[PDB]
């Protein structure tokens, strides 16, 4: 009994379920889960729901966004040939501009769908909950940006189109390249994983809960994981189902939570997150005594069902499979929070141009600071949107090379720099003759040549 008016699809049913779970058996849930998948289907059907190259809308300013980027390059090379500015240089941006546009597109499109689709597929399935991702829906209509060459050189001219337009060859090749690389990889890291586990399990094979007695009262602290003001993990979860070495003490603005040995169920978490606590100490089998194993009590809930482990179970090998697996899918924004621009605090970001040179231009190093975390770029002194002072480098897709056009490459956003060499190939067949600089000789900074 809680009627819930909400668009349910992915996640809505996820936590639902749990909810059920705790509050009712499994058995029930199951049978719930079922009945409802059953909905799922039949309605789906009933809706009837198809897709097509046409269904692959295009975000209109596809256009501007794009050929703008082009004329960018025009400037680029302008001075580039004209040796105000030059090759590692202007080129380390005839590159960036592309991938900035790439965001620009990333935006125009999603933004667009976000304000369209009266229950349209790209809103009934994609955007909401379905195989649709963004990633591939970007270049289901978006413009691919640079990508790379077999190895990790990002080839110059981006993969301008998407798959309506369909490529033309070259790309087509390029595209391939990638795909092959991806391939052979796969063919490898397959093993690599399996390999692991196999170790893991070996090393972590028999820490079996043997023993409730244990002893000790020490543990370990915890705290949300919080790279930058981005806080990765609501403390909350991270607490799940452990046991509280001592009493989680709210700002005494309240009194005493959870003494001790307190299998810490969620609810309890979510709240005592929101009593703002900051760490807490949790019988860490990293300590606690239990022979060649972890204290039954100092272990905590078994995520197999979000309830403390039973007994005589080799949590070790279990903790191995868990890790092991997903390892496999180690690949090695959306909800239009803004557009293709991201976490632009108040006004400013700093990089390098010598290997870019075409005037106001640049590739990339880091970013600094002043993190009001609201449209303006990076600084303090408040923007328009949400006004509370913060400070630190901020992931901003639109990064740098100034907008000679529509954006200097974004889709590597970074909130180890070794050398390489400037082709100065003969740009024509004639009487080469340098001057106004002539090569201050040496064997210090270059070496001996």
């Amino acid at each position: 009994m809680i009627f819930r008016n909400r668009v349910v699809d992915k996640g809505q049913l996820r936590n639902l379920i749990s909810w059920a779970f705790t509050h009712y058996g499994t058995a029930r849930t199951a049978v719930m889960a079922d009945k409802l998948k059953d909905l799922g289907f039949r309605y789906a059907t009933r809706a009837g729901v198809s897709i097509s190259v046409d269904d692959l809308m295009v975000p209109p300013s596809k256009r501007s966004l794009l050929e703008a980027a082009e004329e960018e390059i025009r400037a680029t090379e302008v001075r580039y040939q004209r040796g105000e500015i030059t090759e590692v240089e202007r080129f380390q941006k005839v590159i960036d501009t592309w991938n900035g546009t790439s965001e620009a597109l990333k935006d125009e499109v999603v933004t667009h769908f976000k304000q369209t689709n009266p229950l349209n597929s790209v809103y009934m399935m994609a955007f909401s909950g379905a195989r649709g991702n963004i990633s591939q829906v970007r270049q289901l209509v978006g413009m691919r940006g640079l990508m790379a060459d077999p190895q990790g050189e990002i080839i110059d001219l981006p993969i301008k189109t998407n798959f309506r337009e369909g490529l033309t060859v070259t790309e087509y090749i390029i595209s391939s390249y990638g795909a092959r690389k991806g391939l052979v990889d796969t063919a490898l890291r397959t093993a690599d994983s399996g390999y692991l586990t196999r170790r893991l399990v070996d090393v972590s094979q028999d820490v079996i809960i043997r023993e409730i007695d244990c002893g000790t009262t020490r543990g370990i602290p915890v705290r949300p994981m919080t790279e930058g003001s981005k806080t990765l993990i609501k403390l909350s979860t991270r607490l799940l189902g452990r046991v509280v070495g001592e009493d989680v003490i709210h700002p005494k603005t309240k009194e005493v939570i959870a003494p001790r040995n307190t299998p810490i169920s969620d609810d309890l978490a979510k709240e005592i997150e929101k009593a703002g606590v900051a760490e807490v100490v949790v019988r860490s089998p990293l300590t606690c005594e239990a022979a060649r194993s972890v204290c039954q009590h100092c272990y905590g809930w078994s995520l197999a069902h979000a309830k403390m482990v039973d007994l005589g179970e080799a949590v070790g090998i279990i903790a191995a499979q868990s890790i092991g697996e997903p390892g496999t899918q180690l690949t090695m924004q959306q909800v239009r929070s803004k557009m293709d621009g991201t976490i632009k605090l108040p006004r400013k970001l700093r990089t390098r141009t010598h290997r870019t040179r075409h005037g106001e231009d640049a590739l990339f190093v880091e970013s600094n600071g002043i993190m009001i975390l609201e449209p303006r770029k990076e600084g303090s002194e408040t923007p328009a949107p949400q006004e509370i002072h913060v400070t630190q480098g901020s992931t901003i897709y639109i990064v740098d090379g100034q907008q000679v056009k529509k954006g200097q490459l974004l889709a590597e956003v970074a909130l180890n720099t070794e050398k390489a060499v400037k082709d100065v190939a003969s740009d024509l067949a004639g009487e080469v003759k340098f001057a106004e600089v002539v090569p201050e000789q040496k064997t210090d900074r270059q070496g001996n040549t």
């Binding site: 289907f41 039949r42 059907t45 009933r46 809706a47 009837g48 729901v49 198809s50 897709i51 097509s52 190259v53 046409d54 597929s121 399935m125 994609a126 379905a130 195989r131 649709g132 991702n133 591939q136 270049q139 289901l140 077999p150 190895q151 080839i155 001219l157 798959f163 309506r164 337009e165 369909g166 490529l167 033309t168 060859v169 070259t170 087509y172 090749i173 595209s175 391939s176 390249y177 990638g178 795909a179 092959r180 690389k181 991806g182 391939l183 052979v184 796969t186 063919a187 490898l188 399996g194 586990t197 196999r198 399990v201 039973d310 179970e313 080799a314 090998i317 279990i318 191995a320 499979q321």
Partner: protein, 707 residues
């Protein structure tokens, strides 16, 4: 599958590498392959990259590098007249080379002053004047099954990888129909299979029964412009051994059947290189791999939910998608130093499916239904005895049956086969005597089998559409169409995801146009020379106009392109979202359900190590490797584990008597120690050890050892 298996080329091999000893960057698209090795093309398994096939146009110089055909563009403009340019055996022509996809001004001139070009292994914005070389076409670097994709240009690569391959595995059918929208490029492909039969020379057919075309050894105008000009040695004019035969149903390296009905009429006029009868799956003399049926895209509940396909019943009811398969079965008799062992009609213990569908030598008549346990050929064996339990002597006594003496290894159809018998092929001293040293007869026997489609069959499109049948619906339940024409597959709509194979809608659509227009249409990847998608306003265009040539109207709806209403059979309504619809060309795939099905209560064990004999043909068994056990002990109550480790694999006696013990009707007894332990002892022991597995019993604690 041939072609592409001839013009395959490979890196491995003696002289080559090994998989291991060569790793990775030696598997990549060295940018010289361009034009010479279809990059799209590869097994995987490890072999990715190690096995490429040949671009379409490539070929090799007597040194054995690949001269690459091109076109000499003067003042950045190909004169076309040039019979291509068979040079560039290596990618370093070093030059302005144009990628054979160029908006080209009519009459030579290129058009855009931003024509790319490779150059020194680089692409490079170029201008039309200062350029040399253009590719002959924009679809040469690719190979068979890759440059054929209806709308390649529009897809992920790799997906198209898969595509290609699937294409190679499509079984052939009774009459695989030429698809609807095809890439042009194929007639040839067929033609050069050499699975068809080709106007050798010339002539105007005369006599053509279904086994040959005596337009050949007959002697009239066929055979006789098979008298027009009249070969060097060959039967220069007469009825010539241009008696091509033509062959029906021979087995394939995949047990598939092949055959070439006359196809041509009688009294008419053929010229060399034309084509006379058709191979397995080719059709108008051109390739035809699978068929084309009307498809819709919707999310049919459960069946089709995900990676699942529905199907009308008419599908295979019209005999579409059924194929042949036929079958080798040989068997042989052999002088035991007990004797021969034979082939009788006669065998003990017979009556129906035994001594019934059996010849005087216990063979079969050609052309006999058989079934799953019946006899192919019966032979016995000098078994004798010389080793028996008194209880057997008893049971004689009681019946005092002076038992017989002869094992009786008839040959029986195993199970899950059907199907007429085509043939036999006896082999003995007189019958060729092709047999091992000391064998007497060898018998082959060949049995064939229609097979309709049926749930459980990889079956996919030409675009990595790996899918499996799940339900078949009796035809009167599918959403049919506005014209009531029942559609009949129904894949999942949401497409071009990780597959990025949007290409396939394109053509569905298209098909449907030429399906309503009822007209095939060739095409080519990279519909360039057009600022816009080009392919996009074709296809619409065609549709568009497809309405009005029949005015059916619902043939095309600009609003919601090619979407249609649809009712649905079960009850009779469409829905809020019109669904696209198309015909589409699918294709069914060799590895068929039966090819992978197995079971084992128990059966033969191993030699050395007695654990069931698991190898795929013959009663094998599922191996439970460590990671598998890592799913058992990781769970709670793991008896199973245990036992699984033994009584169903090793305590030998354990095995049995369990078995028993259930037959009794009770539980089973406690296990013992598996074998392969005991084995390990042995080895180790056989290698400077003193293993004391041993107990420590008594209050006096007793140290022993054991077997």
């Amino acid at each position: 599958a041939e072609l592409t298996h001839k013009r395959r080329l490979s890196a491995l091999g003696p002289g080559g590498l090994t998989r291991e000893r060569a790793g990775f960057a030696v598997r990549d698209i060295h940018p010289s392959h361009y034009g010479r090795i279809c990059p799209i093309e590869t097994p995987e398994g490890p072999n990715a990259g190690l096995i490429g096939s040949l671009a379409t146009h490539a070929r090799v110089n007597q040194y054995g590098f690949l001269e690459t055909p091109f076109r000499p563009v003067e003042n950045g403009r190909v004169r076309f007249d040039q019979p291509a340019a068979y040079m560039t055996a290596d990618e370093e022509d070093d030059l302005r080379v144009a990628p054979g996809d160029i908006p080209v001004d009519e009459n030579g001139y290129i058009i855009g002053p931003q024509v790319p070009v490779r150059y020194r292994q680089e692409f490079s914005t170029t201008t039309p004047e200062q350029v040399d070389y253009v590719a002959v076409s924009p679809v040469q670097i690719v190979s068979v099954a890759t440059s054929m994709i209806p709308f390649l240009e529009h897809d992920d690569a790799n997906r198209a990888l898969m595509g290609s391959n699937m294409q190679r595995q499509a079984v052939p059918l009774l009459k695989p129909e030429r698809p609807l929208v095809g890439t042009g490029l194929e007639a040839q492909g067929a033609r050069d299979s050499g699975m068809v039969i080709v106007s050798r020379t010339d002539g105007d057919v005369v006599y053509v029964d279904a086994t040959e075309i005596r337009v050949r050894v007959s002697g009239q105008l066929p055979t006789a412009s098979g008298k027009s000009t009249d070969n060097g040695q060959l039967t220069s004019q007469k009825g010539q051994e241009i008696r091509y035969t033509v062959s029906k149903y021979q087995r394939s390296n995949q047990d598939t059947c092949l055959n070439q009905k006359p196809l041509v009429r009688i009294g008419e006029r053929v010229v060399a290189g034309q084509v006379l009868a058709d191979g397995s799956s080719t059709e108008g003399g051109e390739l035809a791999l699978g068929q084309n049926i009307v498809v819709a895209y919707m999310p049919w509940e459960g069946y089709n939910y995900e990676d699942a396909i529905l199907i009308s019943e008419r599908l295979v009811q019209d005999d579409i998608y059924t194929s042949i398969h036929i079958e080798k079965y040989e068997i042989e008799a052999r002088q035991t130093k007990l004797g021969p062992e034979e082939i009788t009609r006669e065998i003990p213990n017979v009556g129906e499916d035994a001594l019934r569908q059996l010849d005087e030598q216990g063979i079969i008549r050609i052309g006999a239904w058989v079934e799953a346990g019946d006899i192919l050929v019966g032979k016995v064996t000098p078994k004798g005895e010389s080793d028996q339990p008194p209880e057997e002597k008893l049971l004689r006594a009681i019946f005092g049956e002076k038992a017989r003496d002869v094992r009786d290894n008839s040959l029986r159809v195993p199970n899950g086969e059907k199907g007429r018998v085509v043939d036999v092929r006896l082999f003995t001293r007189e019958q060729g005597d092709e047999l091992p040293p000391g064998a007497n007869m060898v018998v082959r026997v060949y049995v064939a089998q229609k097979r309709k489609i049926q749930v459980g069959d990889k079956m996919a499109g030409r675009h990595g559409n790996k899918g499996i049948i799940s339900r078949i619906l009796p035809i009167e339940d599918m959403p049919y169409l506005p014209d009531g024409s029942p559609v009949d597959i129904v894949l999942n709509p949401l497409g071009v995801p990780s597959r990025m194979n949007v290409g396939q809608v394109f053509e569905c659509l298209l098909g449907w146009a030429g399906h309503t227009l009822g007209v095939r249409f060739k095409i080519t990847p990279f519909d360039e020379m057009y600022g816009e998608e080009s392919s996009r306003r074709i296809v619409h265009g065609k549709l568009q106009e497809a309405r009005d040539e029949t005015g059916k109207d619902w043939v095309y709806n600009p609003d919601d392109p090619g979407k249609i209403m649809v009712y649905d059979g079960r009850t009779g309504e469409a829905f809020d979202r019109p669904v696209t619809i198309g015909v589409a060309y699918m294709l069914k795939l060799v590895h068929l359900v039966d090819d992978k099905i197995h079971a084992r209560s128990t059966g033969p064990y191993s030699l050395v190590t007695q654990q069931p004999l698991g190898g795929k043909a013959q009663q094998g068994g599922q191996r439970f490797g460590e990671m598998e056990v890592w799913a058992l002990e990781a769970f709670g109550a793991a008896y199973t584990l245990q036992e699984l480790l033994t009584v169903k694999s090793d305590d030998m006696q354990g095995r049995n008597e369990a078995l028993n013990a259930i037959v009794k009707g009770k539980a089973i007894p406690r296990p013992g120690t598996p074998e392969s332990f005991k084995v390990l002892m042995r080895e180790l022991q056989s290698l400077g050890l003193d293993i004391a597995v041993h107990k420590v019993e008594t209050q006096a604690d007793g140290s022993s050892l054991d077997v």
